[PDB]
Amino acid sequence: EVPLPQLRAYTVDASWLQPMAPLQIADHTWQIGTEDLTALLVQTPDGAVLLDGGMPQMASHLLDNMKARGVTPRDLRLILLSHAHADHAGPVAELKRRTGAKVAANAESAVLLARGGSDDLHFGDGITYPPANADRIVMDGEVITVGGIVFTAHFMAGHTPGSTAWTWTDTRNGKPVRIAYADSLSAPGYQLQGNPRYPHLIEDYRRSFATVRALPCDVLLTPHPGASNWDYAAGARAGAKALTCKAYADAAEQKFDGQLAKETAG
Ligand SMILES: O=C(O)c1c(-c2ccccc2)oc(-c2ccccc2)c1C(=O)O
Ligand SMILES: [Zn+2]
Ligand SMILES: [Zn+2]
Structure with a gap:
């Protein structure tokens, strides 16, 4: 007799989970995610914006990179998203809890995010x-x-x-x-x-x-x-x-x- 299978966590290449220091793109814009997942910090005289956070487990790393750039939890005003899959919007719920950030998104992305990516x-x-x-x-x-x-x-x-x-x-x-x-x-x-x-x-x-x-x-x-x-x-x-x-x-x-x-x- 065979039981139902265990849940399988989605696993990714090591480079997707590999921390990197902030990499400057332009005067106000930095890559602050890992070697293989984008998370963009845009820093301004009136607060900071994050576009994407990467995977669920990247929250603390993003916050460390923000601090290295002089951006405090209170300083983060806004999160935007490319799309609401686990590998880009992972850590959004945790970032909202640990910072001042609010999320702006279109209705489709908001609905999927509210679902935590379920029923994709x-x-x-x-x-x-x-x-x-x-x-x-x-x-x-x-x-x-x-x-x-x-x-x-x-x-x-x-x-x-x-x-x-x-x-x-x-x-x-x-x-x-x-x-x-x-x-x-x-x-x-x-x-x-x-x-x-x-x-x-x-x-x-x-x-x-x-x-x-x-x-x-x-x-x-x-x-x-x-x-x-x-x-x-x-x-x-x-x-x-x-x-x-x-x-x-x-x-x-x-x-x-x-x-x-x-x-x-096929
Ligand atoms: O092609 C893509 O867009 C995606 C990939 C991918 C991208 C390049 C190489 C291997 C896989 O992974 C993912 C993915 C991986 C883990 C969890 C969720 C999505 C993709 C997605 O966002 O749909
Ligand atoms: Zn995707
Ligand atoms: Zn993806």
Whole structure:
């Protein structure tokens, strides 16, 4: 007699869990996550913003990196998200408890976050994390301003219903740098065609390729840094091979077209 299987925790490559010191992207913007998961701190004269936190277990590390940058728990005003999967929104509930941060997100991301990632359209209850509530709901193209860094939301549904690119203008050497944090355009293990839980999935992805291609994009960053060819562990060379938003979108569309063909064959 065979019992039901134990629960299996989702495990990741060691580099996804490997702490790194803050890496400066532009005058106000730093990577403060691990070697292989993005978590961006944007520091202003009127508080700080975090875009993504990575996995559930990264909360204390993020807080240590914030302190190294001079940002206290009270100083963190706002959390934004690329999308609400465990590997990017992991530690959000814990950060809200340990800091002043409030969460702004679109309705789709807020609903999935409130679920802690459960009942995912594709992963089901396979990748759950602690639930969190959003404090503010944002619409496509809506702007949020903190200390004169202006973040604009660009909905790019597909990877999740609520996938979002966040764009802002920072500086380097007194010159503007248009940063684009574009969400994932992967479909890992997804049923793409005739999916009853996401009937217009393909059309949403195609529109999202177009959105990403057109973003204001001097520097592209992605939730998984490898997708945009970042190597955070390479210090001074971390961003040298980085893709343009146009190149990222083209590569993603080519991979998606291959996946569609394999699906039809399978
Ligand atoms: O966010 C996702 O859906 C992806 C995840 C993931 C999601 C939740 C928990 C653990 C991993 O891994 C990957 C991934 C796995 C291996 C290599 C690169 C990315 C994802 C992707 O392709 O977007
Ligand atoms: Zn994801
Ligand atoms: Zn991911």
